Design a protein around this ligand. Sequence first.
Ligand SMILES: [Br-]
Ligand SMILES: [Br-]
Ligand SMILES: [Br-]
Ligand SMILES: [Br-]
Ligand code: NA
Lengths: 453, 454
Amino acid sequence: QQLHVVFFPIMAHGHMIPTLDIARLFAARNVRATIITTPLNAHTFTKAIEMGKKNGSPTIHLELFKFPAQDVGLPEGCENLEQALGSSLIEKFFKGVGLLREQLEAYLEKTRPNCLVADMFFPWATDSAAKFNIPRLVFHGTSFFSLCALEVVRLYEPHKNVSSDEELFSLPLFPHDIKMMRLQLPEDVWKHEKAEGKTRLKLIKESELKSYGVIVNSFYELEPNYAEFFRKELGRRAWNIGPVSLCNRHECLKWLNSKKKNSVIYICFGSTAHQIAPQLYEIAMALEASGQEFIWVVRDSWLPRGFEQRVEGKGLIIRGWAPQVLILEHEAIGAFVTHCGWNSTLEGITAGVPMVTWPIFAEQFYNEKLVNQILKIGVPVGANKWSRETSIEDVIKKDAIEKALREIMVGDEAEERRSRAKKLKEMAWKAVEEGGSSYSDLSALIEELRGYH
Amino acid sequence: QQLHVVFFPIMAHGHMIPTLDIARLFAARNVRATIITTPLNAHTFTKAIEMGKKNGSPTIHLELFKFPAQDVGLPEGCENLEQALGSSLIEKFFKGVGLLREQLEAYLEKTRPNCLVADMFFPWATDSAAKFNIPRLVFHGTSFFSLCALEVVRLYEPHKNVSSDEELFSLPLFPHDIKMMRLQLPEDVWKHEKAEGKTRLKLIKESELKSYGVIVNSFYELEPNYAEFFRKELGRRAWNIGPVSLCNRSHECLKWLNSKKKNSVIYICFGSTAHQIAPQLYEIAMALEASGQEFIWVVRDSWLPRGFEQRVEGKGLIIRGWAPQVLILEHEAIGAFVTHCGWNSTLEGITAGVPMVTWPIFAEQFYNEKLVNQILKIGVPVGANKWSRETSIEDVIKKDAIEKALREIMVGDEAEERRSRAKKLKEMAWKAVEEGGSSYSDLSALIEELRGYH
Ligand SMILES: [Br-]
Ligand SMILES: [Br-]
Ligand SMILES: [Br-]
Ligand SMILES: [Br-]
Ligand code: NA
């Protein structure tokens, strides 16, 4: 009789889409998959389900919970983490999602599924599932490297034994030597201790040991030392089942067919990225000065006069939606400028494209270390300040940007980075195919859920 | 209304007695303490409560659960782990205690206490307490060293890279170099893989991270490297509150001892739990006589040499049954303690400042023996190296091995140094449990933390 797994992502585009992909991976092994969402977020899933269904692909069920926006003083329209801009709104959003516990517990009591896969941001989901002897898995949607780095920083606080903003400290027990500065950490953790953010991270990392285990959107062969470190040194039970976006598997593409292999730079910072006019201006000048052909995705005081005319042969600006995967996988694309969010980083890896890394917040400075120092498939733009706000002082200048654009295309080790990225691409596809490490760990997890008593 | 803590020990004398002592330590901080037991075990608590009460001491409540003996095919009389001898009986005993879950959940629903202190052998008690938003503490009744050693052996399997019974391997991450052989580990783990015992240990060790934390019957200053290792390297939240047997603490054998030189007499006591076969007792008797050492031997007549008691009349005393163990160990005349090196026994040797001849048999005892001999350096091994819940005639320790250990603990090269080291641990143990001590302090901190839990 059919195994039932319930998936409960936080309402953030970057968590919802990989959660859907995991639900789809489970559905393809004949597991009943239900995703919990809210009314204003349902369209994201309904569209994406049908736009990957009608091929005999199994059915993903949606369950809708009421988000108590009014109750916590959020606008009725604010059912997504992206809409909660400002310190006030974010704190209210987290109180809001915390009040979904009553609905989760009623749903589990009613449906009695075999497993709950709950977002990292719901540490309390473990106790909710335990009430009905249901195992809970934690899903973060980041790298093993980041999960390990964050935890060694939290436990060993290497940044308390420094005396300046830019003083380098090593990550303590790691099998690679990784240096960071305080600038690269959120200001709550290092400068003015704020129990809210600090208590939230503590409960998230503790959930990894208190729960049945951790599903990870990565492949063993990508970061073997950290897949092991997470399980051995840090004691987590984990399954690596990614890259989960490989599960199922236009004018700009015609434009690219005309171009030399590895000749074009793709720049796309995602939907999370909040780009100010002065920053866009420095990118525009750097692109022109670099001489490099480019496809630049933007979400006009911020364009140099005559930009659009000067770059007619060489540069394409797309306002809004780009077919990102089809662009990255085009032979003409030789590099990817990214914020180093894990979804973007994994798409660069899967396309075999070297990356210019532009970390901003969250786990991105850890992802940047993986890409540049361990995988050696990237070049840093030189952003070293962790910030969820964009101060004019933190804008990266034309000269830093131009240096990185040139290095990733024609720098001495640019070809070596391309060769290394092409190897990871082959290893990624091999992980997800029958017999691969990710296919295998998914089989092992399901078998283990089937036998749980 | 006062904080209420429920204590749920497994029905083993070695877990019940320390659990009572913890309940008493909690009761003295004005915490309501209830102990869960079964009808045939209640006498152990009733006696021990009243034999330490009538002084206005705060009241420990008992709750009785029915043990489903018939249900798992055990004799009605088998409500204690000591009665479950043989592979068949032990497995049934563990199925039995597992079926107490229904009664635990009904009791917690009814009483709604602030915290459940549940035996290591009840990993499911964490989820049972969580149903009513009650924090669960794990209690094992052993050393930090044993908790760390078992876990490093389970995770890193140093014994899998071996080819023979007696080949020595090091314990992996420890700041001391500790060498063991497969013989010293249970035969399920190393020889013939049995998922039952292996799954049981896995769920016990996992409960240490899944639960609110771990109460430990040890003191920080006794094993500082392992008190830290358990919390840092292994990530457990833990409180060290022992030796818990000091809580209550502010005839003819004692008259017999007053006649004797300081540190001249060996005390031998394996406990009432101890199952000793006639051939083994016989080898001990011969070793004691041959050693020339004065002795007090506590035994729980085919196994005595003819004329033994008469030949040793000046030098040796055999006590049949109850001995005033504390008063004997604390007598100036007692220079050594022959023990099985279970943690309760090991801690009483430490608290009396008496060096120990270590005779490990099963459970965590070979790890405790490494702590005593290699780290504390207050003991000498008898040379038992075989982990066994059964005593086969083939595994008996012979007179010559026993005599060698009796001589070594009394007059061997480092005998004086072992006595000096043990006397330091004695002072540190009493300092830990007095107001301002590490164990007094961690107990205050735990209670404060339980008081502020939401
Ligand atoms: Br690696
Ligand atoms: Br870097
Ligand atoms: Br130590
Ligand atoms: Br030894
Ligand atoms: Na660890």
